[PDB]
Design a protein around this ligand. Structure first.
Ligand SMILES: CCCCCCCCCCCCCCCCCC(=O)OC[C@H](CO[C@@H]1O[C@H](CO[C@H]2O[C@H](CO)[C@H](O)[C@H](O)[C@H]2O)[C@H](O)[C@H](O)[C@H]1O)OC(=O)CCCCCCCCCCCCCCCCC
Ligand code: CLA
Ligand code: CLA
Ligand code: CLA
Ligand code: CLA
Ligand SMILES: C=Cc1c(C)c2cc3nc(c4c5[nH]c(cc6nc(cc1[nH]2)C(C)=C6CC)c(C)c5C(=O)[C@@H]4C(=O)OC)[C@@H](CCC(=O)OC/C=C(\C)CCC[C@H](C)CCC[C@H](C)CCCC(C)C)[C@@H]3C
Ligand SMILES: CCCCCCCCCCCCCCCCCC(=O)OC[C@H](CO[C@@H]1O[C@H](CO)[C@H](O)[C@H](O)[C@H]1O)OC(=O)CCCCCCCCCCCCCCCCC
Ligand SMILES: CCCCCCCCCCCCCCCC(=O)OC[C@H](CO[C@@H]1O[C@H](CS(=O)(=O)O)[C@@H](O)[C@H](O)[C@H]1O)OC(=O)CCCCCCCCCCCCCCC
Ligand SMILES: CCCCCCCCCCCCCCCC(=O)OC[C@H](COP(=O)(O)OC[C@@H](O)CO)OC(=O)CCCCCCCCCCCCCCC
Ligand SMILES: CC1=C(/C=C/C(C)=C/C=C/C(C)=C/C=C/C=C(C)/C=C/C=C(C)/C=C/C2=C(C)CCCC2(C)C)C(C)(C)CCC1
Ligand SMILES: CC1=C(/C=C/C(C)=C/C=C/C(C)=C/C=C/C=C(C)/C=C/C=C(C)/C=C/C2=C(C)CCCC2(C)C)C(C)(C)CCC1
Ligand SMILES: [Fe+2]
Lengths: 30, 33, 63, 81, 34, 341, 36, 37, 38, 34, 504, 33, 37, 30
C-alpha cells in the first residue's frame, strides 16, 4: 500500500506539471 | 513492512481535504463575471 | 437598527464610545504599578530559578 | 548631509594625525602591557601554561557543585603549590 | 598591584594630549551651543 | 510640549546614526553582547566548565576560540554577577561561564531592540513594516536554539557555545544523538535557505541580463537614476525567456518580491519548530517498520540503517570528552568499531 | 581640507593591516598553539 | 430580512490553484513516510 | 531573616535603577540643551 | 564650520578605542611560550 | 475579490456576527472536550492504578478532570482504586455530557446572533454607525474574571464549597483530592506549594475586582488612546494574542519542570527526576532503614512498594519518545505486570557491581559495571579478541531481592547478560507486550506531548502578535505607501526630525 | 471486533468523493447570476 | 483559437444539494456495515 | 473505529436535517 501511495502522489505532481505549463493562465500585455 | 494502519487514511485525507478546499474556491471564481 | 428588551438594560454600557480623559491622565500612576508588577515577576522568576533563595522556601518536590 | 563632518575631510586633515599619531600607538602599547605584565591572567583567572594541572594531577578540575562552585574553584588553585 | 597602572598612562597620556590639541576648537563648539 | 515631547524630538532626529526610542534598549544590549564575546574569546578560558582552551591568551586561533557554556552542575541558572553562584567576584564569574548567559540574554534583548528599530523607522519614513516582519524568523531561530533547547534539557551546558568550531561540534552532536538530518522540519528549513539562495541568484541575474540601454558606456551601472519612473529592465522579455527555458515564469513584480520574502522566512520558522521538539528529545530518529524487519532479516540493508551505525559511533567516541561531568569510562573492548579501522 | 592625500593614507593603512595579520599567521607556528 | 452590508466575494485564480495543489502534494509526499512509519 | 541571595537581589535591583536613572538624566539634559527649532 | 563631538563621534570611539587596545594585547600574545 | 486568507475580515465591523463566530468557536471547543472525554472512557483500564495508571495509557483530558476533583465513574470504579463509591452526577460521564449539552446550546445561540445581526445595541447613538466601547468592555469582562477568580479559590479550592484539588506526597505514592488552605507566607510563591495556588486566585481575584471597577469608571488618557489605537478593535487582538502566548510558555514550563499544579500521578514522572536519581535515593534510603533495624536483605527490598520502583525506571522518562512514535506508553515497552525485583550483580571475588544507567540523551548505551568507587570491572565487549572484562572471565552473577524472583540467583552468562541489559533502564519489570503488539520502542508520556504542543503553539502565536500588532499601527499604509511621496520627506539632513514636516 | 482494515478508508472515500462533487457544483452555481 | 460555441454552464440548486447529500449519506450508513464486515 | 464511523455518519444526517429545514430555499409565488 505504501509503494502505491508514494507512486500515486508522485504521478499527481507530474500531472500538475503538464497542466501548470501548457494550460497556464496566458501572460497578457495591456 | 509493518507500517501504521492509519497512515493510509491519514495521507489520503492530508491530500483530499485541502485539495478540494482550493478546487471549491477556483471553480466558483471562474463561474463569476 | 432593531431594539430588544435586554440590549437596552445593556445600552448605557455601550454608548460612551471614543470618550477620553484629557492629556496624560492616570499614565504616571499606571507606570508605577507596572514597575511593581515587574519586580514581582522578577522575584517569582528568581525563586523558581533558585537565583534567589529565601528562608523556609524549599523549591523542590519535598514540600 | 546630516550636518556631520565628512570622514574624508578628517582622516586627511593634518590635525587629526597630530593627535591620532600618538593615540593609536598609546592604546596599542596599552594592549601590550596588559598581557606582558601578566595582569590579563589574574583579572579573568585564565590558567598560565604551567597552571592547568599539578605535577602528577591529570584529572580536569571540573566544577561539580553549583552553590559552592566559587569554593571548589579556589580549592583547585591551592593544589598548585 | 602596580601593573593596574603601568597599562593606563598611554591611555591617560594619549587622552591628555588629545585635550590640549582640540579644546580651543571645542570651547568654540559649546560656546556656539549656548 | 513637556519633557516627554522634547526628549522625543532629540531621539527621532535625523543624524548619521538614528537613535530613537528603540536605541535606549538596542545599543547597550547590542554593544555589551558583542563586546562580551570579544572579551571572552580574547582572555577568558573554558577550563573549569569544559576542560578546554578557548581564548587567544591560551593559544587558540579564530576557528577555535569560543565563549563556552557553563558547567552542567549550574543547571538553568541565570548566573548573575551578584547572584548566589559568583557572589560578586568577577574572576570567579568568568571561570564559571557567566559570560555565556551575559551574551545570551543581553543578545536576546538586543534582537528585540533591532526589531523595534525596524518598526520605529518604518513608521516615521512612512512605509509598511514588512522588513520588521521578516526579521521574526532570525529571532525564532535564536530563541528556539539558544534558549528553548537548553531549557528543555538539563542545563545551558548543551546549548551552542559562541564559537566557530564550537558550532561545528553542535552540528555533529545533533546528528549523532538526535539524527537531526532525518527530521522533516529541518528538511523544510533546508529548502528555505537553499531555495532562498536560488531566488537571490536567479533574480539578480535576470535583472542584470534584461536591462534596457539607457546609456552609452559598456559598464551599464550608471544608466540608472533613482528618480526615474520607468523600469530599468524588461519584465516582458524576462518572462518569455523563462517560460521557454523552464516552463513557467513570473509575470507580476509584486508577487515575485513577496515570494522572495516568504520562502526563506517560512523555512527558518519550520526549523525553529523542529528543535523545539528536540528540547524534549522528541526526535525523528527511527522508522519503526524498518527496524522491526531489519532485526529479524540480517540481509536487509538500506542507506538509512547505515547512518544509524555512524551515529552509534559518534555517540560512543565523543561522549566521554564532550560530557566530562558524567565521568564516562569506556574500555577499549566496548567501543563499537568496524573491521581493521 | 585635503592636505595629506588619501591614496597615501590608504596605502599606509593597508600596509598596517598586512603587518598585523602577518604576525598573527606567524604566531601560529611558534609559542602557544603550535602543537610543539 | 435585510442583506448584510459586510459581505464580499472570494476569489482564487488559476495560478494560486497550481501553487496550492503543488504545496499540498509535496507536503504529503514528504510526510507520508512518517505517517506510515 | 535576610539571606545573602536576598541581599544581592537588592544590589542588582539598585544597580539597574542607577543605570536607568543616569541614562535618562543625561538624555533629558541633552534634549533640553539641543532643542529642535520650529 | 562643523561640530567636533557628535553622537557619531561617540559611536566611532565606542568601537575604535577598545579595538586598538585588543590589537596590542593579541600582538603581545604571539610571543608567549609554553 | 477577497483572497482566501482574508475571508474572515468581514466581521471587523459586524459585532453581531463577530459574537456569532466567537459563539461557534466556543461551541467547537466544548464539543471536543466532551468527545475527547468519551473516547478516553471507552479505552481506559481502571483495574490497576499502580503499574498501569492513566499516564501510561495516553490519557490527555482525564488528568485535567481528576486535578479539580472529578475522580469517579458511573460504572463504579475510581482512579484511586476504590470500589463502592457514588460520585453523584459530576462523574467522568457527567462532565462529558455537560460539555456536550452545552456545546449544542451555543450552536443555537450562534444561529440567532447571526440572523439578527442588526441590533441597535451595536450602534453608536450619536453617529448611527457600528461602534463598541472597548475601554468599558474591558473593565466589565475583567470585573467578571476577578469575581470568578476569587470564587474559584475561596470556595472550590479551599473546600469551603467544592472538592478541592489533587495533592500528594513528594514521591507521588498516596495521591488524593484534598481541600487546601491558602499559604500567605513566602512559601506561597513556591511552585510546589498547593496553598499558594489557592492564595493566588483569592488575592489576584480581589485585585481583579478593583482593577475591573477602575477600568469601568475611568476613561483612558488621550495619548494612550491615540498611541495604541483604542478605537480599532484589532489592537485588542494584538495585545490578547500577546498575553495568550505569554501564558502558553508558563504552562509549558511548569509542565516540564513540574509544579504543584501538575502532579506526577496524573501525567507521569519528569525528566529531571531521572537525572538526579530522585527516586533511587529514597528507595535505597528505605533499604538501609530496614537493614539497620535487623531485617534481612530479602526483607528490606520486599518492603519497597512496586509503585516506588515503577518510578525509578527510564521507560517512564518523558524524554525517551519520538516525534512519530504515536500511541500510549504501553504500546512501547508493554503493559506493566509485576516488579521482578532488585538485581544485585557480583563477580567471582564476591563484591557487588553496579550497572551504569542509560542517560536520556542516548538511544543506545553499552553495558558497563563499575564498583563502589566507579572502577570498571565488568562489561559486555564489542571486540572480544582482546577483551578483559567479559562476564565469563569475571564470573558475573545476578541475584534478585523482592518482587517475583525474590531469592533467585542466576549464574549462566547468557541469562545474566539479559538482566544486565535491562538494568541500564532501572528497576526491572515484567511486561505484557502481546495484548497491544508492543514494538519495544520507548514513547513519551502525556507530560511530554502537552509540553511539545503548547511550546510550539506559544512560538507560533508570537508571529500573530507582531503581525496583527503591525496591522493596527500601520493601518494607513496597509494597501501601500502614499503615491505622491517625494525625495524630500526621505532626504537626509533636510527635516531635523525624520518625517516631521513642521521642522524644515 | 476483527473488522476489515480497508473498510475505514472505503467508507471515508465513499462519503467524501461524491460529497465534494455536489459541493463544487453548488458553490459555482450561487457565484453566477 | 476561436472559442468553442458548444459550451454550456452547469447548475445545481440548493435543494438538489440536500437531496444528493442525503442519498450518499444514507447509502454510506447502509453499506458501511458490509465494508467493515 | 467502527462505532465512531457509524455515529459520525448519523450525526451528519441529523446536521443535514437542520439545514434542509431552517436553511431551505424559500418557495415564492408568482
Ligand atoms: C518570543 C520571543 C520573546 C523574546 C525573548 C525574551 C527572552 C527573555 C528571557 C527569558 C528568561 C527566561 C529564563 C527562565 C529560566 C528557567 O526557566 O529556569 C529553569 C527553572 C527550573 O529550574 C530547573 O528546575 C529543574 C526542576 O527541578 C525540580 O526537580 C528536581 C527533580 O529532582 C529537584 O527536585 C529540584 O529540587 C526541583 O526544583 C532542575 O532543578 C534544573 O536543574 C533547574 O535548572 O525554571 C524557572 O526559573 C521558571 C520556570 C517556569 C517559567 C518557565 C517559563 C519560561 C520558560 C518557557 C520555556 C519553557 C520551555 C519548556 C521546554 C520546551
Ligand atoms: C544542505 C545543508 C544545510 C542547510 C542549508 C541547512 C540549513 C539550516 N540548518 Mg542545518 N544542518 C545540516 C545541513 C544543512 N542545514 C546538517 C547536515 C546538519 C547535521 C545534523 C545540520 C545541523 C543543524 C543544527 C544542529 C541546526 C541547524 C540549523 C539550521 C538553520 C540555520 C538557521 C540560521 O540561519 O541560524 C543562524 C542564526 C540566526 C539567524 C540567529 C540570528 C543571529 C543574529 C541576527 C546575528 C547578529 C550578528 C551581529 C551583527 C554581531 C556579529 C558579530 C560577529 C560576526 C563578530 C537552517 C534552516 C539550526 C536550526 O534549525 O535553527 C532552528 C540548528 O540549530 N542545522
Ligand atoms: C538597556 C539597558 C540594559 C538592559 C535592559 C540590561 C539587561 C540585563 N543585564 Mg545589563 N548592563 C547594562 C545595560 C542593560 N542591561 C549596562 C549599560 C551595563 C554596564 C554598566 C550592564 C552590565 C551588566 C552586568 C555586569 C550584568 C548585567 C546583567 C543583565 C541581565 C539581568 C539584570 C537584572 O537582573 O536586572 C537588574 C535591573 C533591574 C532589576 C531594574 C529595576 C529598576 C526598577 C526601575 C525598580 C527601581 C528600583 C527601586 C529604586 C528600589 C531599589 C531597591 C532598594 C530599595 C534596595 C539583563 C539581561 C547580568 C547578566 O546578564 O548576567 C548573566 C549581569 O551580571 N548587566
Ligand atoms: C494539545 C493537543 C493535544 C495533545 C498534546 C494530545 C496528546 C495525546 N493524544 Mg490527542 N487529540 C487531540 C489533541 C491533543 N492530544 C485532538 C484535537 C484530537 C482530535 C482529533 C485528538 C485525538 C486523539 C486520539 C484519537 C488519540 C489521541 C492520543 C493522544 C496521545 C498520543 C499523541 C500522539 O501520538 O502524538 C502524535 C503526534 C504527531 C504525529 C505530530 C503530528 C505533527 C503534524 C503532522 C505536523 C504538521 C506539519 C505541517 C503540515 C507543516 C506546515 C508547513 C507550512 C508550509 C505550513 C497523547 C496523550 C491517543 C491516545 O493515547 O489515546 C488514549 C489516541 O488514540 N489523541
Ligand atoms: C485567536 C487568534 C487569532 C485571531 C482571531 C486571528 C484573526 C485574524 N487573522 Mg491571524 N494569526 C494568528 C491568530 C489569530 N488571528 C496567529 C497565531 C498567527 C500566526 C500563525 C496569525 C497570522 C495571520 C496572518 C499572517 C494573517 C492573519 C489574518 C487574520 C484575519 C483573517 C484570517 C482569515 O481569514 O483566515 C482564513 C483562513 C483560512 C481560510 C484557512 C486557514 C487554515 C489553516 C492554514 C490550517 C487550519 C487551522 C486549523 C483548522 C485550526 C486549528 C487551530 C488550533 C490548533 C489552535 C483575522 C482578523 C490575515 C489578515 O490580517 O488579513 C487582513 C493575515 O494575512 N493572521
Ligand atoms: C548565521 C547567519 C546569519 C547572520 C550572522 C545574520 C546576521 C544579520 N542579519 C541582520 C539582519 C537580517 N537578517 C534577516 C534574514 C535572515 N538572516 C539570516 C541569517 C543570518 N543573519 C537568514 C537565514 C535569514 C532569512 C530569514 C533579515 C530580514 C534581516 C534584517 O533586517 C537585518 C539587516 O539589516 O540585515 C541586512 C543583521 C542584524 C544586526 C543586528 O541585530 O544588530 C544588533 C546586534 C545584536 C543584537 C547583537 C547580536 C548578538 C547575537 C545574537 C549573539 C552574540 C553573537 C556574538 C557577538 C558573535 C558570535 C560569533 C559566532 C562564532 C558564534 C545582521 C548583520
Ligand atoms: C479535520 C479533518 C481535516 C483532515 C484531517 C487530516 C488528518 C491528517 C492529519 C495527519 C496527522 C495525523 C498523524 C497521523 C499519524 C498517526 O497515525 O497518528 C495516530 C495517532 C493515534 O495513534 C494510535 O494510537 C492507538 C491507541 O489509541 C494505537 O496505539 C495505534 O497504534 C497508534 O497509531 O493519532 C494521534 O495521536 C492524534 C492526536 C495528535 C495530537 C498531536 C498533538 C501534538 C501536535 C503538535 C502540533 C504542532 C504542529 C505545528 C506545526 C506547524
Ligand atoms: C554607564 C554609563 C551610562 C552613560 C549615561 C548615558 C549616556 C547617554 C549618552 C548618549 C549619547 C551622548 C550624546 C551627547 C554627548 C556628545 O558629546 O554629543 C555632542 C553634544 C552636542 O553636540 C551637538 O551635536 C549635534 C549633532 S548630534 O546630536 O550629536 O548628532 C549638533 O546639532 C550640534 O551642532 C552639536 O553642538 O555636546 C555636548 O553637549 C556635551 C555635553 C553633553 C554631554
Ligand atoms: C557595509 C555595507 C556597504 C554596502 C555598500 C553599498 C553602497 C553602494 C551604493 C553607493 C553609495 C555610495 C558609495 C558608498 C561608499 C561610501 O560611502 O563609503 C565611504 C563613506 C564616506 O564617508 P564620508 O561621508 O566621510 O564621505 C565623504 C562624503 O562627502 C561622501 O559624499 O565612509 C563612511 O560612511 C564610513 C562609515 C564608518 C562608520 C563607522 C561605524 C559606525 C558605527 C556603527 C553605527 C551603526 C550601528 C547600527 C546599529 C544597528
Ligand atoms: C564584557 C563586559 C563588559 C563589556 C566590555 C566591552 C564593551 C568590551 C568591548 C571590547 C571590544 C570592542 C573589543 C574589540 C576588539 C576588536 C578586535 C580584536 C578586532 C580585530 C580585528 C581584526 C583582527 C581584523 C581582521 C580582518 C578582517 C576581519 C577582515 C579583513 C582582514 C583583517 C585581517 C583586517 C563590561 C566592562 C561593560 C562589563 C563587564 C563585562
Ligand atoms: C445541537 C444540540 C445538541 C447536540 C450537540 C452535539 C451532539 C454536539 C457535538 C459536538 C461535537 C461532536 C463536537 C466535536 C468537535 C471537534 C473538534 C472541534 C475537533 C477539532 C480537531 C482539530 C482542530 C484537530 C486538529 C489536528 C489534527 C487533525 C492533527 C493533529 C494536529 C491537530 C490537533 C491540530 C444537544 C442534543 C446536546 C442539545 C440540543 C442542540
Ligand atoms: Fe528586484
Amino acid at each position: 500500500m505504501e509503494t502505491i501511495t508514494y507512486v500515486f502522489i508522485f504521478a499527481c505532481i507530474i500531472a500538475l506539471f503538464f497542466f501548470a505549463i501548457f494550460f497556464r493562465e496566458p501572460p497578457r500585455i495591456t | 513492512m509493518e507500517v501504521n494502519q492509519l497512515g493510509l487514511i491519514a495521507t489520503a485525507l492530508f491530500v483530499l481535504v485541502p485539495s478540494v478546499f482550493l478546487i471549491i474556491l477556483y471553480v466558483q471564481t471562474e463561474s463569476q463575471q | 437598527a432593531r431594539r430588544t428588551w435586554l440590549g437596552d438594560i445593556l445600552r448605557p454600557l455601550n454608548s460612551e464610545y471614543g470618550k477620553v480623559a484629557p492629556g496624560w491622565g492616570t499614565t504616571p500612576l499606571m507606570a508605577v504599578f507596572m514597575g511593581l508588577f515587574l519586580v514581582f515577576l522578577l522575584i517569582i522568576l528568581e525563586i523558581y530559578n533558585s537565583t534567589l533563595i529565601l528562608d523556609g522556601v524549599n523549591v523542590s518536590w519535598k514540600a | 548631509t546630516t550636518g556631520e563632518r565628512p570622514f574624508s575631510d578628517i582622516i586627511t586633515s593634518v590635525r587629526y594625525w597630530v593627535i591620532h599619531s600618538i593615540t593609536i600607538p598609546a592604546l596599542f602599547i596599552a594592549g601590550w602591557l596588559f598581557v606582558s605584565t601578566g595582569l590579563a591572567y589574574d583579572v579573568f583567572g585564565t590558567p598560565r601554561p604551567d597552571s592547568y594541572y599539578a605535577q602528577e594531577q591529570r584529572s580536569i578540575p571540573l566544577v561539580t557543585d553549583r552553590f559552592e562552585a566559587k569554593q571548589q574553584v579556589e580549592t583547585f588553585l591551592e593544589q598548585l603549590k | 598591584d602596580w601593573r593596574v597602572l603601568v597599562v593606563l598612562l598611554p591611555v591617560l597620556l594619549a587622552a591628555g594630549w588629545a585635550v590640549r590639541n582640540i579644546l580651543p576648537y571645542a570651547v568654540k563648539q559649546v560656546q556656539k551651543l549656548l | 510640549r513637556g519633557w516627554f515631547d522634547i526628549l522625543d524630538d532629540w531621539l527621532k532626529r535625523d543624524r548619521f546614526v538614528f537613535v530613537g526610542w528603540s536605541g535606549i534598549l538596542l545599543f547597550p544590549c547590542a554593544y555589551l553582547a558583542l563586546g562580551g564575546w570579544l572579551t571572552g574569546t580574547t582572555f577568558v578560558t573554558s577550563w573549569y566548565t569544559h576542560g578546554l582552551a578557548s581564548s587567544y591568551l591560551e593559544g587558540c586561533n579564530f576557528l577555535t576560540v569560543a565563549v563556552s557554556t557553563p558547567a552542567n552542575s549550574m543547571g538553568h541558572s541565570l548566573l548573575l554577577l551578584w547572584g548566589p553562584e559568583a557572589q560578586g567576584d568577577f574572576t570567579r564569574w568568568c571561570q564559571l561561564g557567566g559570560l555565556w548567559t551575559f551574551i545570551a540574554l543581553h543578545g536576546a534583548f538586543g534582537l528585540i531592540g533591532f526589531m523595534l528599530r525596524q518598526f520605529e523607522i518604518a513608521r516615521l519614513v512612512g512605509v509598511r513594516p514588512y522588513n520588521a516582519i521578516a526579521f521574526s524568523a532570525p529571532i525564532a531561530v535564536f530563541v528556539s536554539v539558544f534558549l528553548i533547547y537548553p531549557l528543555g534539557q538539563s542545563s545551558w551546558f548543551f546549548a551552542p557555545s559562541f564559537g566557530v568550531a564550537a558550532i561545528f561540534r553542535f552540528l555533529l552532536f545533533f546528528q549523532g544523538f538526535h539524527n537531526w538530518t532525518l527530521n522533516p522540519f529541518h528538511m523544510m528549513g533546508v529548502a528555505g535557505v537553499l531555495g532562498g539562495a536560488l531566488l537571490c541568484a536567479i533574480h539578480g541575474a535576470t535583472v542584470e541580463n534584461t536591462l534596457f540601454q539607457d546609456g552609452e558606456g559598456a559598464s551599464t551601472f550608471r544608466a540608472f537614476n533613482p528618480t526615474q519612473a520607468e523600469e530599468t529592465y524588461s519584465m516582458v522579455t524576462a518572462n518569455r525567456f523563462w517560460s521557454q527555458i523552464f516552463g513557467i515564469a513570473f509575470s507580476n513584480k509584486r508577487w515575485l518580491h513577496f515570494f522572495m520574502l516568504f520562502v526563506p522566512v517560512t523555512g527558518l520558522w519550520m526549523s525553529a519548530i523542529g528543535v523545539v521538539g528536540l528540547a524534549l528529545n522528541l526526535r525523528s530518529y527511527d522508522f519503526i517498520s524498518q527496524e522491526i524487519r531489519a532485526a529479524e532479516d540480517p540481509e536487509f540493508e538500506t542507506f538509512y540503517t547505515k547512518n544509524l551505525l555512524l551515529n552509534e559511533g559518534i555517540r560512543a567516541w565523543m561522549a566521554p570528552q564532550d560530557q566530562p561531568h558524567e565521568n564516562f569510562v569506556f574500555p577499549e573492548e566496548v567501543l563499537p568499531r568496524g573491521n581493521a579501522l | 581640507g585635503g592636505r595629506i592625500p588619501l591614496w597615501i593614507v590608504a596605502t599606509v593603512a593597508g600596509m598596517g593591516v598586512i603587518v598585523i595579520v602577518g604576525l598573527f599567521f606567524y604566531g601560529a607556528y611558534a609559542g602557544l598553539g603550535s602543537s610543539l | 430580512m435585510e442583506p448584510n452590508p459586510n459581505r464580499q466575494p472570494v476569489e482564487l485564480n488559476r495560478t494560486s490553484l497550481y501553487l496550492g495543489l503543488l504545496l499540498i502534494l509535496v507536503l504529503a509526499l514528504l510526510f507520508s513516510s512518517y505517517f506510515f512509519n | 531573616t535576610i539571606t545573602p541571595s536576598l541581599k544581592g537581589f537588592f544590589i542588582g535591583l539598585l544597580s539597574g535603577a542607577v543605570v536607568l536613572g543616569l541614562t535618562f538624566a543625561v538624555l533629558i539634559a541633552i534634549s533640553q540643551i539641543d532643542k529642535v527649532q520650529r | 564650520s562643523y561640530p567636533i563631538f557628535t553622537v557619531r563621534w561617540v559611536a566611532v570611539h565606542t568601537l575604535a578605542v577598545p579595538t586598538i587596545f585588543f590589537l596590542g594585547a593579541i600582538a603581545a600574545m604571539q610571543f608567549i611560550q609554553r | 475579490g477577497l483572497p482566501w486568507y482574508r475571508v474572515h475580515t468581514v466581521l471587523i465591523n459586524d459585532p453581531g456576527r463577530l459574537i456569532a463566530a466567537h459563539l461557534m468557536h466556543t461551541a467547537l471547543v466544548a464539543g471536543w472536550a466532551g468527545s475527547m472525554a468519551l473516547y478516553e472512557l471507552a479505552t481506559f483500564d481502571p483495574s490497576d492504578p499502580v503499574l498501569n495508571p492513566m499516564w501510561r495509557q495516553g490519557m490527555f483530558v482525564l488528568p485535567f478532570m481528576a486535578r479539580l476533583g472529578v475522580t469517579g465513574s458511573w460504572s463504579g470504579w475510581s482512579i484511586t482504586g476504590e470500589t463502592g463509591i457514588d460520585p453523584g452526577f459530576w462523574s467522568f460521564e457527567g462532565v462529558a455530557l455537560a460539555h456536550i449539552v452545552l456545546s449544542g446550546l451555543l450552536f443555537l445561540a450562534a444561529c440567532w446572533h447571526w440572523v439578527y445581526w442588526d441590533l441597535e445595541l451595536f450602534r453608536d447613538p450619536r453617529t448611527g454607525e457600528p461602534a463598541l466601547d472597548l475601554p468599558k468592555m474591558f473593565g466589565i469582562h475583567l470585573f467578571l474574571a476577578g469575581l470568578l477568580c476569587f470564587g474559584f479559590g475561596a470556595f472550590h479550592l479551599t473546600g469551603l464549597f467544592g472538592p478541592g484539588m489533587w495533592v500528594s506526597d513528594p514521591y507521588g505514592l498516596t495521591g488524593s483530592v484534598q481541600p487546601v488552605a491558602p499559604e500567605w507566607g513566602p512559601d506561597g510563591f513556591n511552585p510546589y506549594n498547593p496553598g499558594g495556588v489557592v492564595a493566588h486566585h483569592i488575592a489576584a481575584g480581589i485585585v481583579g475586582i478593583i482593577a475591573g471597577l477602575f477600568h469601568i469608571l475611568v476613561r483612558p488618557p488621550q495619548r494612550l488612546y491615540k498611541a495604541l489605537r483604542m478605537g480599532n478593535i484589532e489592537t485588542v487582538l494584538s495585545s490578547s494574542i500577546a498575553a495568550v502566548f505569554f501564558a502558553a510558555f508558563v504552562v509549558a514550563g511548569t509542565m516540564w519542570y513540574g509544579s504543584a499544579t501538575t502532579p506526577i500521578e496524573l501525567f507521569g514522572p519528569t525528566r529531571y527526576q531521572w537525572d538526579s536519581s530522585y527516586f533511587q535515593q529514597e528507595i535505597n534510603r528505605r533499604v538501609q532503614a530496614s537493614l539497620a533495624s535487623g531485617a534481612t536483605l530479602e526483607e528490606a527490598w520486599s518492603a519497597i512498594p512496586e509503585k516506588l520502583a515503577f518510578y525509578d525506571y527510564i521507560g517512564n522518562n518523558p524524554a525517551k519518545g519520538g516525534l512519530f512514535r504515536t500511541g500510549p506508553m504501553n504500546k512501547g515497552d508493554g503493559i506493566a505486570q509485576a516488579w521482578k525485583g532488585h538485581a544485585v550483580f557480583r563477580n567471582k571475588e564476591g563484591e557487588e557491581l553496579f550497572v551504569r544507567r542509560m542517560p536520556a540523551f542516548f538511544e543506545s548505551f553499552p553495558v558497563i559495571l563499575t564498583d563502589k568507587n566507579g572502577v570498571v570491572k565488568a562489561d559486555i565487549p564489542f571486540r572480544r579478541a582482546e577483551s578483559k572484562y567479559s562476564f565469563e572471565q569475571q564470573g558475573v552473577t545476578v541475584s534478585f531481592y523482592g518482587g517475583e524472583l525474590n531469592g533467585q540467583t542466576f549464574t549462566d552468562p547468557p541469562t545474566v547478560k539479559s538482566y544486565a541489559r535491562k538494568a541500564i533502564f532501572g528497576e526491572i519489570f515484567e511486561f505484557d507486550t502481546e495484548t497491544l503488539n508492543s514494538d519495544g520502542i520507548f514513547r513519551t508520556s502525556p507530560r511530554g506531548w502537552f509540553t511539545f504542543a503548547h511550546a510550539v503553539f506559544a512560538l507560533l502565536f508570537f508571529f500573530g502578535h507582531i503581525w496583527h500588532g503591525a496591522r493596527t499601527l500601520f493601518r494607513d499604509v496597509f494597501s501601500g505607501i502614499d503615491p505622491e511621496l517625494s525625495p524630500e520627506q526621505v532626504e537626509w539632513g533636510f527635516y531635523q526630525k525624520v518625517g516631521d514636516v513642521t521642522t524644515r
